[PDB]
Write a protein that binds this ligand. Sequence first.
Ligand SMILES: O=C1c2cccc3cccc(c23)C(=O)N1CCCN1CCOCC1
Ligand SMILES: *[C@@H]1O[C@H](CO)[C@@H](O)[C@H](O)[C@H]1NC(C)=O
Length: 377
Amino acid sequence: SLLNSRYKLVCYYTNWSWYRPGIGKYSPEDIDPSLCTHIVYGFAVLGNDGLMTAHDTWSDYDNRFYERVVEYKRYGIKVSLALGGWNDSAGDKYSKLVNDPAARAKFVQHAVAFLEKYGFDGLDLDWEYPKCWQVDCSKGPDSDKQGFADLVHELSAVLKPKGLLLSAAVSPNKMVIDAGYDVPVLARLLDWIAVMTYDYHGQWDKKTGHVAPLYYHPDDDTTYFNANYTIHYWMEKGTPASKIVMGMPMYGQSFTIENRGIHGLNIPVSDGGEPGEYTRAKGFLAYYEICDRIRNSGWTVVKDPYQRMGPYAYKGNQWVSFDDVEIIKKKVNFIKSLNLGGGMIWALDLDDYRNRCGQGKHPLLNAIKTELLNPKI
Ligand SMILES: O=C1c2cccc3cccc(c23)C(=O)N1CCCN1CCOCC1
Ligand SMILES: *[C@@H]1O[C@H](CO)[C@@H](O)[C@H](O)[C@H]1NC(C)=O
């Protein structure tokens, strides 16, 4: 069992996966309690009053999604509530909060009351990102860094006496890490740091790339857009290995290629890939959408024989990069070899939890669990 192990497996639950057709529909009761040590509920949002609030009252409150996920505490799983996320990070409201000591003080007391009201074990900060709002480092003030560190301290000061957890999902990007994070402060106060070692590449690059490279590849634009650099950089900035959980994507980044007879890495891309039937987001495909394309629609899969990155797959002018079971076992062995705190997955609802692709239920998450529980490295 993962609960008796030395590792965390932090699983992100998303409340919007309920709004998906057919087998893509995912509910709190679909969570497999044998596959996680920690569940993080995404997302609460920052209201206009500067207070944490439910993002989707119909699911979170009226259909009791908060309660139905907090239910998993009965298994010994720690259930935290995540604040923020990509969409909620678009504007300046998180920056206005952290730069205002009075606003932080009000926010912190209300947030802790919020957590205890619904029985959450902790809070997960997912501002994307301090200073570099949605990875645009020209947008936010440098004081976002000190303000975020002060917010983490003031939260920690209230949560820790109550035995509540405080964690943060953080950028894998070296420039964002430098600009937004007071790493020694965060490393000391957070119970764990979920490094989002994915989305290194996507349609915004205007060329094909892998969503989550593990190691440097000789054709890479940079030396630091890979999980190996990112994790070592967080530790170099002062993070203990035991506080790091390494994120792994349960999805792929998809691309519409120009289709000048080529389909490898770094080829020109005109747009995100066509949206999937279930996730309905251009540039994005769940793992269970990807394996159906490979198994039943004849997409061609290219693997890296050196296992520096997961596979990619293509058909026509459509191209998607993702993690399969093989690279995931390599990544978990990477986690164990560095004695990291454990792993994190985005997200529960994107793995093949229905066994639509015939490799068993939850093939990616079961591969992580199996490798984490294997003593050999
Ligand atoms: O990193 C970027 C990004 C970076 C730089 C420019 C962009 C322009 C448009 C869209 C994105 C970006 C973008 O969507 N992302 C992914 C963040 C959410 N990911 C988390 C898990 O699932 C969903 C994907
Ligand atoms: C991983 O990163 C470290 C430091 O950034 C580097 O020394 C090492 O060569 C990298 N490993 C691989 C396999 O690239």
